[PDB]
Amino acid sequence: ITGTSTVGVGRGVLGDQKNINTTYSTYYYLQDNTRGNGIFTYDAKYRTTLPGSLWADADNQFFASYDAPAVDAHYYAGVTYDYYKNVHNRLSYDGNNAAIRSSVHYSQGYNNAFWNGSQMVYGDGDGQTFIPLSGGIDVVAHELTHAVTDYTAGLIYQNESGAINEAISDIFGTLVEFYANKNPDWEIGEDVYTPGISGDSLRSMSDPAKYGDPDHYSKRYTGTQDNGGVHINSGIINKAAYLISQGGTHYGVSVVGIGRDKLGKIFYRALTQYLTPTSNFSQLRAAAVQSATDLYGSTSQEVASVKQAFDAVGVK
Ligand SMILES: [Ca+2]
Ligand SMILES: [Ca+2]
Ligand SMILES: [Ca+2]
Ligand SMILES: [Ca+2]
Ligand SMILES: [Zn+2]
């Protein structure tokens, strides 16, 4: 809506205090006018009609328990916006400062979050398996990144292309987490998963097999569940991504790590310039190798490390 830009303050899902950009027009709305064509956060009010109502607040103070998921969806959308702009020179998910809209309090006890083709959706979790999923910055950036992929490579959400789609989202989800530099790791969802259990997460990039996900192609899932295993076989690519950045020996293959930033540049370039809707794992290897060549030279350590990594996960 039309109004004046101001700055609110509140607490997120983890009890942390943060400022948020809002818009005043009788009420203070969760509308951030400082990023592109705006960031907009809505209340689905425990129902599943979307997007719901633009979040309105009377005093610009968001310290109510009900406010927390909105605070974080709004804030971490902004962090994710900042990451794509400052690091990859990318203006929102479509590259042309599309408005980023989020809805929270989706359904009742909804243990998930997603991008629905046009916006972000966040459940509150049932309080046992999950707390409000917008509490996880990797979760927020994971889903926003599906918006980026859909507008770029267009990787079809199934089988290998689908598993690449998922890995890409786990990759930048993680890089945005490190970018915010708050308890960063190579795990996914740990901030909001199983509040009653420490140390766990939905997935691990550094060791997929800790949750039963493959870390080698020869261990790939070929059934038809989970759209052919997109959240399973993603472990093979996540593992490769982890290796390129952090290095290691995996099934006897040594990888020289090149760090997060170079991982980020190679996979972004791959994502936006070489991958296509039907790309398979072998094709991703080729795209990554070419991105690193483009970026660092065919004789670079970088290109070599990319090859090592895909080698280690059995992807030729
Ligand atoms: Ca208030
Ligand atoms: Ca973390
Ligand atoms: Ca994480
Ligand atoms: Ca937990
Ligand atoms: Zn996903």
Say whether 143 is catalytic: yes
Which has the closest alpha carbon to 190: 144, 136, 152?
136
| Token duo for residue 194 | 């199983």
Q: Annotation-wise, does 57 bind a ligand?
A: yes
Say whether 231 is catalytic: yes
Return the ligand number nearest the Cα of 66: 1
C-alpha torsion sign, points 55, 13, 180, 92 = negative
User: How many whole angstroms separate alpha carbon 295 and alpha carbon 308?
Assistant: 17
User: How many whole angstroms separate alpha carbon 270 and alpha carbon 193?
Assistant: 30
Enumerate residues with CB within 5 Å of ligand 1 (an ion): 57, 59, 61
Compute the distance from residue 23 Cα to the ligand 5 centre, in Å. Answer: 30
Q: Annotation-wise, does 37 bind a ligand?
A: no
Say which of 143, 160, 250, 302 is annotated catalytic.
Answer: 143
Contact 70, 13 (CB under 8 A): no
Q: What domains can you pick out in the chain, each with its CATH number?
A: 6-154 (3.10.170.10), 155-315 (1.10.390.10)
Q: Output Rg (C-alpha) for the chain, integer angstroms.
A: 19
212: left (phi over 0), alpha (psi -120 to 50) or beta: left
Reported resolution, Å: 2.0
Say which of 74, 105, 231, 250 is annotated catalytic.
Answer: 231
Torsion of CA 196, 198, 202, 205, to 10 degrees: 180
Q: Annotation-wise, does 160 bind a ligand?
A: no
Compute the distance from residue 214 Cα to the ligand 3 centre, in Å. Answer: 19
Return the ligand number nearest the Cα of 201: 4
97: left (phi over 0), alpha (psi -120 to 50) or beta: left
Compute the distance from residue 194 Cα to the ligand 4 centre, in Å. Answer: 4
Q: Annotation-wise, does 187 bind a ligand?
A: yes
Contact 40, 56 (CB under 8 A): no
DSSP 250-272: ETTEEE----HHHHHHHHHHHHH
Which has the closest alpha carbon to 251: 209, 188, 197, 301?
209
Contact 111, 126 (CB under 8 A): yes
Task: State whether residue 128 is helix, strand or coil.
Answer: coil
Q: What are phi and psi of 204, to 5 degrees?
A: -130, 135
229: left (phi over 0), alpha (psi -120 to 50) or beta: left
- Identify the helix (H) or strand (E) that includes residue 115: strand 113-115
Compute the distance from residue 212 Cα to the ligand 4 centre, in Å. Answer: 17
Return the ligand number nearest the Cα of 9: 1
Method: X-ray
The alpha-helical segments, DSSP class H, found in the chain are 68-88, 137-151, 159-180, 226-229, 234-246, 260-273, 281-296, 301-312
Compute the distance from residue 139 Cα to the ligand 3 centre, in Å. Answer: 8
Q: Annotation-wise, does 168 bind a ligand?
A: no
